């Protein structure tokens, strides 16, 4: 009963960049989702141990969560916005794959994904 190491949030060898799109992702997209009533189960890596989901990391081999995304943004881990958008999508997809439809957690992810899509609809053109 161990969790895996969480996804990296910094890497000495990975080129780093600030873009206006990455700024929007932190200041508008992540900020909006982070403070949502349904954010909290997504604010850190899935703790398969504490949540008693022993098969979680047998099924989900590409874990992701908003805690991780938040640190990546803050750390300037990403080169581009598409990397960050991909992380959000992974987090939602993992949830839909692992959990039963009608579980509360699935309803929560669906609400946050709708808001995410609303906010990324207006991602500004890059400068």
Write out the residues near ligand 14X by the rule CB under 6 A. 41-42, 46, 51, 95, 98-99, 104-105
Please report how close the Cβ of residue 7 comes to ligand 14X at its closest, in angstroms. Answer: 14
Nearer to ligand 14X, 26 or 66 (CB): 66
Residues recorded for the chain: 127
DSSP of 53-111: -TTHHHH-SS---HHHHHHHHHTT--SSHHHHHHHHHHHHHHHHHHSPTTSHHHHHHHH
Nearer to ligand 14X, 59 or 117 (CB): 59
Nearer to ligand 14X, 21 or 94 (CB): 94
Please report how close the Cβ of residue 105 comes to ligand 14X at its closest, in angstroms. Answer: 4
CB 34 within 8 A of CB 27: no
Please report how close the Cβ of residue 4 comes to ligand 14X at its closest, in angstroms. Answer: 14
């Amino acid at each position: 009963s161990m969790n895996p190491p969480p996804p990296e949030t910094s890497n000495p060898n990975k080129p780093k960049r600030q873009t206006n799109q990455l700024q929007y992702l932190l200041r508008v997209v992540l900020k909006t989702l982070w403070k949502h009533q349904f954010a909290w189960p997504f604010q850190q890596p899935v703790d398969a141990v504490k949540l008693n989901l022993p098969d979680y990391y047998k099924i989900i081999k590409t874990p992701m969560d908003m805690g991780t995304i938040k640190k990546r943004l803050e750390n300037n881990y990403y080169w581009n916005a598409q990397e960050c958008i991909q992380d959000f999508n992974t987090m939602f997809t993992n949830c839909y794959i692992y959990n039963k439809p009608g579980d509360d957690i699935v309803l929560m992810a669906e609400a946050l994904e709708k808001l995410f899509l609303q906010k990324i609809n207006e991602l500004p053109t890059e400068e």
